[PDB]
Symmetry: C2
Subunit: 324 residues, 2 copies
């Protein structure tokens, strides 16, 4: 009654056709979609061989956008490398703070990363870290606080935005520090954080982690082709790690999960802190997304300082190099 009425074609067969076999489906799908039978064969064998929903999938499903683009319409990064370093420098440890901070600056200069994430930075004896400003642009998350985080980037790195999100469920002043910029024509996002500490704060830490991954997921959706780096001292236990978004990988895992570079906080090997029993964790991690698919991963800051016989920090630094 209020249904559409189709245009008559005078020399067209005057009956619409009307079950079938599997090869009939192959052919039918091919004729209807104007695609070949080999492509038909791909779709229909991921469902019972239901022609009706095979059509809906070809036209409507998000998985087949490439196929639709091919049906309708029919890199510069080789030789490019970028290194990211992350280090909880334990500024809250007053013992040999100045000497340790000098060692930190020395180690940073030797490793020479393009991008450096720092956690537990304090105002006291910050001078040698501030000296890095000759080589880096320095962004402090929350200056005026007992302790905070920093992002240092090479002078070639153009910065557009610096945002700091304060976790409201944190009793430890923890934040998400976000730096948006670019290296040449390539857009880059940096997300540095120090998640809630200690096993008992698992609820806070796990909520924070998932929130951070939500932010990463938003950045990726809004910036195709961009490089995204998220990490820092995440204080994670392996079983705490929730689902990471599509296209995001753990740098240490993508480098081959080397046992020799696994633990970043290790009291068996680092005696800056001492318990009755040794403990060890992969607290410091780095995640990335973007048009670089290969990665090398090493630990740094593992040499005992000779003047005072301690390590720069109770953490090892992680150093990841991404390339294509």
């Amino acid at each position: 009654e209020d249904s559409e009425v189709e245009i008559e074609i005078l020399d067209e067969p005057e009956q619409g056709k009307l079950s079938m076999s599997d090869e009939q489906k192959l052919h039918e799908f091919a004729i209807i979609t104007a695609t070949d039978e080999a492509f038909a064969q791909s779709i229909l064998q991921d469902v019972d061989w239901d022609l009706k929903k095979a059509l809906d999938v070809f036209y409507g499903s998000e998985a087949f956008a490439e196929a639709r683009s091919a049906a309708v319409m029919g890199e510069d990064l080789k030789g490019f490398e970028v290194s990211v370093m992350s280090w909880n420098i334990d500024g809250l440890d007053g013992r040999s703070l100045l000497t340790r901070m000098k060692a930190v600056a020395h180690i940073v200069k030797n490793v020479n990363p393009d991008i450096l994430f720092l956690q537990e930075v304090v105002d006291r004896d910050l001078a040698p870290i501030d000296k890095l400003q000759s080589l880096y642009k320095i962004y402090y998350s929350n200056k005026g606080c007992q302790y905070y985080t920093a992002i240092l980037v090479s002078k070639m790195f153009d910065v557009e935005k610096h945002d700091v999100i304060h976790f409201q469920n944190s009793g430890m002043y923890r934040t998400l520090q976000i730096l948006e910029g670019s290296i040449g024509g390539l857009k880059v996002f940096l997300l540095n954080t120090h998640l809630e500490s200690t096993r008992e704060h698992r609820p806070q830490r796990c909520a924070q982690f998932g929130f951070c991954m939500d932010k990463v997921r938003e950045i990726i959706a809004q910036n195709p082709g961009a490089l995204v780096f998220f990490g820092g001292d995440l204080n994670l236990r392996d079983e705490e790690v929730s689902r990471v978004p599509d296209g995001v990988k753990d740098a240490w895992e993508a480098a081959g999960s080397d046992n020799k570079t696994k633990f970043t906080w290790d009291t068996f090997k680092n005696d800056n802190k001492q318990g009755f029993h040794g403990a060890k964790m992969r607290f410091d991690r780095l995640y990335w997304s973007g048009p670089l698919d290969k990665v090398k991963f090493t630990l740094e800051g593992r040499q005992r300082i000779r003047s005072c016989l301690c390590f720069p920090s109770d953490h090892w630094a992680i150093n990841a190099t991404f390339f294509a």
Copy 2:
């Protein structure tokens, strides 16, 4: 052996706990996630009551980003309206072309839309349409062609980009015309198209439609908060309409699916073209996404021109007004 070793807490109960009932799950989920039992109750009743995957869902699932944001962290458009008009003006009909084009410009001036999509524009007798440049910024898809599409926007509309994608599976010069801009602080995307004509070209038309919806989906993902308008002469039969992306709606349907405004090409009522039997279709449609949720929908150009006794076009124009 290469497993992590947890920090000892001297005054902590020295045994990890270890099946349970439904209220135990409620409590457990509440303690673990540091959320209440009422919120726990929501998740667990969308799965068997599997605590393990209830946790994974809370932390990892994309559906619960708002919940995570609330756990970690804890409009201007009222009074704003925008009208979009779309009209296949049938420039390929030489009969009374100049008079009909004058009527088109007259009708456009009376309706006074902010945004106008035109299809089947030809160079011949284009003068009255070009006269609209005093009121509109005019963008032609493919000038130099037998026929093409246009987008006209109010002078207040700032334009950043004009792109035209030529459908390679089209034997009728069909394109996707994309205008990116803004009205005030509000970003706006316009997608105008004339999909492959005739029932027989269903394969081409349906592929084009899904491709266009892919583009809409990309724009939405990359531009949260933006207004997106996609439509034109889509030549669609109801059964041809594939899945539209999330947050996208048909303007005529959202206006209440009025039978009095359904058909846009109706030979029972429009005699610019004559068959032995009447035909009628909702060929012209408008889809939108963005921060406006209400819509009014009317048909325009339904008056017979008095000097030559024909309608401006064999199509009715569609006119949608979006507001909050």
